[PDB]
Amino acid sequence: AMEIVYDEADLRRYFQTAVLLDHFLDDAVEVDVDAICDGEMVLIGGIMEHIEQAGVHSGDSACSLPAYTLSQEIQDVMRQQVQKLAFELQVRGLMNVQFAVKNNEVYLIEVNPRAARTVPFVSKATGVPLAKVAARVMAGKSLAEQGVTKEVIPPYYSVKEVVLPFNKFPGVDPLLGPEMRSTGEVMGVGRTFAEAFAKAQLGSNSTMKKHGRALLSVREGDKERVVDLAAKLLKQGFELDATHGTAIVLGEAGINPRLVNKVHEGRPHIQDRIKNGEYTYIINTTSGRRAIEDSRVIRRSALQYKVHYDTTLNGGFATAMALNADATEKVISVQEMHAQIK
Amino acid sequence: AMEIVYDEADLRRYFQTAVLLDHFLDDAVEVDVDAICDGEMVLIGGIMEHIEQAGVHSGDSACSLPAYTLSQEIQDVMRQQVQKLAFELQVRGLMNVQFAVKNNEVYLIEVNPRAARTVPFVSKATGVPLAKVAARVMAGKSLAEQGVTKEVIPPYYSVKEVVLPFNKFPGVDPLLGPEMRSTGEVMGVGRTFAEAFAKAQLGSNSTMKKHGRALLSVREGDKERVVDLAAKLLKQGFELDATHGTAIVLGEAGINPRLVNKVHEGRPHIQDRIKNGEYTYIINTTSGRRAIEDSRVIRRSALQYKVHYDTTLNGGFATAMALNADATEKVISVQEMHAQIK
Ligand SMILES: Nc1ncnc2c1ncn2[C@@H]1O[C@H](COP(=O)(O)OP(=O)(O)O)[C@@H](O)[C@H]1O
Ligand SMILES: Nc1ncnc2c1ncn2[C@@H]1O[C@H](COP(=O)(O)OP(=O)(O)O)[C@@H](O)[C@H]1O
Ligand SMILES: O=c1[nH]cnc2c1ncn2[C@@H]1O[C@H](COP(=O)(O)O)[C@@H](O)[C@H]1O
Ligand SMILES: O=c1[nH]cnc2c1ncn2[C@@H]1O[C@H](COP(=O)(O)O)[C@@H](O)[C@H]1O
Ligand SMILES: NCCC[C@H](N)C(=O)O
Ligand SMILES: NCCC[C@H](N)C(=O)O
Ligand SMILES: [Cl-]
Ligand SMILES: [Cl-]
Ligand SMILES: [K+]
Ligand SMILES: [K+]
Ligand SMILES: [K+]
Ligand SMILES: [K+]
Ligand SMILES: [Mn+2]
Ligand SMILES: [Mn+2]
């Protein structure tokens, strides 16, 4: 049971219900890097930039291949670091490295000297049978002999999205965290990131609509950013609703959402509205055990009433960008995909 | 110490704190009636409809001659009740009657068998020197004999507004109630109620503006009428702020004010905003001792910073109308006014 502790009090509190201790890189981009090491050289299979930030298990984050926001200069740090790590541990075959980017600063989160659950996606994305290769490598044939020496960078956008079992265990709080709960995955391919993403979202069984009313209820650290997001939804013709504190910040920015009541606050409240088909979209962020626990009802209602919802601001943005795309506009075969690869 | 208690708890509460017990006529129109009785007949000198409802001392209420909302039918009833009273108590000279209208029903508040403070204004408004006339009657000269037998209903509107000393005693909660606190009064003469009012308002040293942002923070009972108020303001070009509860009702009605925190809710709050010059107008109603005591800050801030404020919705509405008039437009002398009385 891993948990993010915010303060001293918090510490104890976990401790009771309860040891490695790590500092939580808040407001960090999480990255996945799959690579092969033949001993001579190192092939970078792919660099995946997660939509959801560090603190939300790789296993449950959507991810984009190539990175949709990261700087070449930084990818480059990780590129260099992995190489460094590959040779150092003596990687003979596949490997995976997970980083965390915070303030143009690369932090090593973990190294998995084996096949990661990211390979296939990465293989599909790049047209490079990553496993076959490391397989051939482990046995004795080099990256060099394989003529599999250069790192591929597709002409298109490959986004990976996950599917969660929440609907099977309704008593659970359908919320993202440090622990993985997802069962499967989908892949979205688009000319643009927004395209790919919309593809991955539709593919993941999302109920997200392109119209109606959105509900914004975010955590403190998300209050600043939520503005742009809200701006985006307004531009798309979404009508807005917001909880008190979230409504405060919005207003301070020229945006006047409809104020909605929390459960304990009166009527009607979020639950009633949700239940009444009042929303087509919900952006809900929450931080801290107690808070989470207290906000449970919205997520539960949302899931239950099939309202598309995001539990990360990063995830809200993606959802928004995707509103500008048409996931049924254009299809492309995988063979065509790899054909496009020079 | 004259207070209005709402519930049993309230009763006691006062009782510890502190006997005549009267049923409070909530949401009632207060009226003043000045008249003369020569024992032979009764002369109606003036029927004044207060802007502020019963519960706000007559002396601190703005008022209009002729009535601006009362039905002729209801006024006529009053006129008869006055007559009755006059005769019965043996009035010989001036008299004054105070009523409350609730649900198309007339209630007697009190009877002051003497010259009331409304006498000068009524005189000015009607061109009839009630004091002189009444003095005559007292002296033996009858109404018939003096040739003053018909009630005068002027061709223009006369609005009286008061001035309060709260500024002199910053420590006092600048709020209206059942006890009189005002030191003076002014008169506004207009072709319409809106005009008389605007004139009365301006002469009262009101800092009211015709543009800007308005703060709405009203009590439960006022939550319903507030919407129309908000609309009217919106129409006038004003922008809107509002406290939580008030915002909620507004939202439900299609009005999305900009949310503002209560002093104790955090920042940014009303005090901050008021202080910073965000508002040009403030509409704040509050009921019940504790509630009053708690909101005190909003009223104290409004005054200190010179923002125009109304503590009654009836007042807020009058203000609203006045926005549609120009007190600097037309001027009229008393002589001219009296001359129009045919
Ligand atoms: N120090 C940290 N700061 C931020 N996020 C972290 C940190 N450690 C772990 N995480 C998050 O938790 C996830 C799981 O941690 P990780 O060490 O990779 O565990 P696992 O072995 O279960 O895959 C990561 O994918 C990441 O989102
Ligand atoms: N029963 C009542 N219902 C509503 N308002 C009332 C009632 N009794 C008095 N008031 C309010 O209190 C004020 C003062 O009461 P009043 O009997 O006229 O006392 P005073 O001797 O001060 O003139 C009135 O002008 C009115 O606004
Ligand atoms: O009905 C509720 N009860 C408790 N918490 C809620 C409820 N609805 C939303 N929240 C949480 O409220 C937070 C936003 O609060 P705000 O700061 O007042 O806008 C988010 O972290 C939400 O998950
Ligand atoms: O800063 C404050 N502290 C306490 N009460 C306030 C404050 N500002 C406004 N009020 C009161 O809040 C009421 C409106 O509350 P609302 O229903 O949440 O909008 C009014 O009756 C106001 O007098
Ligand atoms: N990639 C995880 C699934 C996303 C889900 N809508 C959430 O934001 O909670
Ligand atoms: N007629 C009394 C003055 C009104 C004041 N603006 C208030 O509404 O409190
Ligand atoms: Cl369950
Ligand atoms: Cl003082
Ligand atoms: K992540
Ligand atoms: K691991
Ligand atoms: K009154
Ligand atoms: K009296
Ligand atoms: Mn991991
Ligand atoms: Mn009285």
UniProtKB/Swiss-Prot annotation, chains A, B:
Binding site for Mn(2+) 3: 98, 110
Residues noted as binding ATP 2 in the record, renumbered to the chain: 23, 25, 30, 55-58, 98, 110
Origin superkingdom: Bacteria
Region (Allosteric domain): 206-342
Binding site for Mg(2+) 4: 110, 112
Binding site for Mn(2+) 4: 110, 112
Binding sites annotated in the UniProt record for Mg(2+) 3: 98, 110
MGS-like domain: residues covered: 206-342
Homology family: Belongs to the CarB family.
Domain notes: The large subunit is composed of 2 ATP-grasp domains that are involved in binding the 2 ATP molecules needed for carbamoyl phosphate synthesis. The N-terminal ATP-grasp domain (referred to as the carboxyphosphate synthetic component) catalyzes the ATP-dependent phosphorylation of hydrogencarbonate to carboxyphosphate and the subsequent nucleophilic attack by ammonia to form a carbamate intermediate.
Subunit structure: Composed of two chains; the small (or glutamine) chain promotes the hydrolysis of glutamine to ammonia, which is used by the large (or ammonia) chain to synthesize carbamoyl phosphate. Tetramer of heterodimers (alpha,beta)4.
Functional description taken from the UniProt entry: Large subunit of the glutamine-dependent carbamoyl phosphate synthetase (CPSase). CPSase catalyzes the formation of carbamoyl phosphate from the ammonia moiety of glutamine, carbonate, and phosphate donated by ATP, constituting the first step of 2 biosynthetic pathways, one leading to arginine and/or urea and the other to pyrimidine nucleotides.
Protein name: Carbamoyl phosphate synthase large chain
Native source species: Escherichia coli (strain K12)
Higher taxonomy: Bacteria, Pseudomonadati, Pseudomonadota, Gammaproteobacteria, Enterobacterales
Gene name as annotated: carB
Range within the parent protein: 724 to 1073 of 1073
